[model samples]
Target: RPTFYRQELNKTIWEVPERYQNLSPVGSGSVCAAFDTKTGHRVAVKKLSRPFQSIIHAKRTYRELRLLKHMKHENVIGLLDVFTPARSLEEFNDVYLVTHLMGADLNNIVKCQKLTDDHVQFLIYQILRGLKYIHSADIIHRDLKPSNLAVNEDCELKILDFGATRWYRAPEIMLNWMHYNQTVDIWSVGCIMAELLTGRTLFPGTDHIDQLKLILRLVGTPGAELLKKISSESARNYIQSLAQMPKMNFANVFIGANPLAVDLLEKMLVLDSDKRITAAQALAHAYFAQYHDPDDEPVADPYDQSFESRDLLIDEWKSLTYDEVISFVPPP
Candidate 1:
């Protein structure tokens, strides 16, 4: 199907293989390889690996594709195209979801650049806007780490990587199989915002329990009233332990952070999931809009690029042929 109508290339949507020039690996996962794919496109390909836990993984990937397929917004990563074969051989078993490549994942940018408060808050606003779109569509990104956020050539922020995405996620108050809800994605947004300010992961532990501790340390542990609101006993214990976690002042953590941004951090970190703000709400918060200019808004489009399809376009496409394109779609 034509993912984009009125399809005259305007520097969005990358044509795979030859057009891309994979520069370096940005992030890695068992199923995805993120790299600078074009002169301007920095893309990550989530491929189907044989060891994927189940077709559920493939289904999730497809779910992401479907969710993003209809999405159209300046902040959301625009889905350019999806490539899958009608038939597959062992090596040929793969599908590629393509979008306008971003400049760098937020993880890399934050790690490398000591951001001014204005820059940090701006990034979070962009992320929140993107998340709002995803959640409204009844899709849970599940993963909203700095690694998933991309800053394109235009400096516009685009959220990417949907391998961990799902449809029936939300309202832990509703289900039994082990709780689910959109709040999981909210937790992720909180994590990403914290990372932006601290230049470190908000919850960087190696395991689930340890990660919980990280959250408590940064946000201050949940109180008893907060725990009671949680529906599950295990969830309650999770917060009680979190509240009692070792002492640290999260406000102080973002020492140079804008006061408004600090406010954002506070609201997002609240232990009560239901009390947390939705992505769209956060976008509307005075905290986010405070520093943004009312006029001449400079786009930080993470997808802007120097890649010209004509420059990389080819008569026939072949894999592994474009050592140049490898930069755009790095090797595993």
Candidate 2:
């Protein structure tokens, strides 16, 4: 298995992952969440670049599918098939990304009613399952908010959306001109966890200034000595200028919560990225003892970084991504 980005089918197969049942559109495999189109079930079809942002050009399309094409995990969404109407790479103009659609997003559900402890534990369990798989491959789920977390009636959770947004943002991005790695992901997960349990957005900062303040208010303000380490002079100065505040108690904030759940939240939402709990470690915590099963959380092989060179060639990307869109996933 030198590479996973090879072409299997010359043309796109609309019903390869599963046959469509009946009903409206929704849109994977032995390895992922799926649906049938012809058998009365429904799925979703996301056509890449319905309005190809200058940022999401054809070459950019290749990069995205390359990642999706290689991804295969039960808690991660699948790219069932990439259907292109184009005859060849020279004509590879229009393509549609077919994927599994779940019942609803966690955000919508949270808006309706509060979740039980059982619901919270299981959903958080699967979230960590998927996060570990993604991080094992050296990928950072830079963006992880409630809306991107799709759920079904069974409480199954599959994380979605890769591009970063600010709401569930980590403090490192706000205060430092630093290299972001996988630790940033834990911070985002911590934020998402807080929202899932309480059904309210945490750290809903309108701007970076408020973002830092909101985070500090909860996690506690850093020492002036620690703040000096920040690369940006303004960030260090601004943080030091603020009034000193103590870290808030998780148990008190998420009232009447189990102490174990509170303990896990404290580990996750720490202001210091270096101190946050990891997906693997968080799963092992006593908070998730009822649901933790390392055997079920399979890790993915690290993805190749061959395409991220300084000088990228469109021809190579164009051909590579065409292969992904036409690739086949043998039906279950």
Candidate 3:
């Protein structure tokens, strides 16, 4: 039992390679203890960091599991396992999460190559198709930034990161609390679409306050009626402040955004949760219906960089036991 690795049906244990350990850590949200199995077979492991509150954070982990359990879509990162205490360490709590390490996220990929309009349209279609599936299952991936969308070896895109995803989500949900639901994902999808066209974050705010300002910077400020329905004082204050901002035009702000998509984006990004577009309505938008054609074959990605070689990060891990891998899994 000690030597045997316990991976769920779809999940498998990956050998820690030296190359991956040395690669720079990716983000604030994850402290990955990765493996580059490039030579024999390939895999990437993620050890999710524990959020501030353990119990609350467990909700995040389980939320992801629940969503993955129900979601069976093509453009989503496949969830492989839920392992425990393989290597127990007191200092940092880590949990093992295994998924095939995909190619770069859309953020890096688009930055590397100036995407054609056709590419943008095609990518957005994949994202919407994924969103359609999620919303249908009553799930919402609140964090839908380009960085979360992974392009694999075959040039397939997959949506990832369920830490912030929520169910029963709506614009009103964000008024006072971090409400999880389809609307948040829709908002994220809009932001991602904007990013694809502009090569910039659709709403790149410095902080939550700045997020509101960024919104005003694009969509005009909200009105009196819009303020009353908000559930939180801070949210209402955001509206009040927005009402005072200089007059702005979304059409002008989203200069490069596809004309068809801009209208849908404006609707989804509304401050009033109630006024925001439903997941189904957003999917039905002409931008998605026309520009995002799934039946069309993806043009050969001239830059599809598949992993052909393997480089191990260190030799220490080979000696490390299953107890050690469990130890390495980032804490919740």
Candidate 4:
């Protein structure tokens, strides 16, 4: 406990790492608002919200921890440190992931200021640049929204989540497909790209069925060949019951958007996962002609996912996660 200091946030004890000063709760679900005394820069210490509340939640905490540990990219959230104030494995109630603090994310930027097509294309270019690295490692971000994309005034966007949100989920996931791939993230990027072009969410749904309805309405219903692949009987039934829908025109959807930008997203938001434009391919598209550096794009080594299949119990996951906390040597 000597290595940490105690403070009050939400009228509850927040025992934070001693090196960080001015600790307070951030606007999100939870966070570490402080200055790193060691490096003399602002850093946010993110606590995994209710990580051990369930077995599934615990697994996500460990998975995200490893994801952050393994990935090193300029456009990905740079993990500076991983520590817990807990003294022992049994006492491991909180998880703190230290990352450099930056300026407002896309939502704040999008709301506060108007964006040019140049800004839109450049931002999409960087997300694709980061996605190429991520998908190369066989990791599907599952969620890629404006909030998770942290940016400064100068506009270097860093992707910040190893998880999913219902709003950005792809059709393959919505239909209960038995197997999904990195294309899910591509669909998500398409969704976010559309949002960036316009000031509103492209597909805002309150539930899974409604979510599917919104996507299908814009992109049109999938054909028999595609929907047949869905493993769920209920999914197949629902699609069959719905009347055919014509794919809405991109020009009409994102009015006044660049033709090339519309073309790029058309290739991205496809229902057939195989037909979706890859992150690598998207970067090369004409929309990014001004920004893409073919030689500079970097791919990552495949991340080992053997741990995902291990079916760890909550306690086991806790110990493994804690071990990483102790074993990790924070970047100096």
N/CA/C clash count, model 3: 22
Worst 10 residues of 1 by lDDT: 315-324
Off by over 4 Å in 4: 49-54, 86-93, 162-165, 228-237, 313-315
Whose lDDT is higher: candidate 2's or candidate 4's? 4
User: Per-residue CA lDDT of candidate 3, range 93-141, in tens?
Assistant: 4354556667577768877777666676668777777766666654556
Scored by TM-score, the top model is 4
lDDT of 1 by residue, 1-332 (tens): 22211211222232234443442333332223334333454455443333223444434433444444556666777655455442322333344555655557776787778777777777877777777666766666665676667785445798766341211122232224244466667766766776677776555466544554455565566666665665656656544543366436656777877677777777766666767777766776787666444342232323312221323212112222122122332222
Per-residue alpha-carbon lDDT of candidate 2 for residues 1-332, written as tens digits (9 for 90 to 100): 11112222223232223242332323221112235534444465554543133433655677677777777898887776566656677877555566677778888878897988888888888888899988988888777787778898887888877332577888777655467768688888878778877787888888877787788888788864566566656666666567878888778898977688889988988776767889889889998889888788789977986766534455655677777756756345
TM-score of 1: 0.64
Error of 1 at 189 (Å): 2.4
Each prediction's total of clashing residue pairs, residues at least 3 apart in sequence or on different chains, is: 29, 19, 22, 0
Q: What is the lDDT of candidate 2?
A: 0.70
Q: Candidate 2 vs candidate 3: which has greater lDDT?
A: 2
Candidate RMSDs in order: 11.6, 6.4, 11.5, 2.6
- The C-alpha stretches of model 3 lying farther than 4 A from their native spots are 1-41, 48-54, 57-61, 81-95, 153-155, 162-181, 231-243, 290-332
In candidate 2, stretches whose alpha carbon ends up further than 4 angstroms from where it belongs are 1-40, 50-56, 162-165, 231-234
Sort the predicted structures by lDDT, highest score first: 4, 2, 3, 1
TM-score for model 4?
A: 0.89
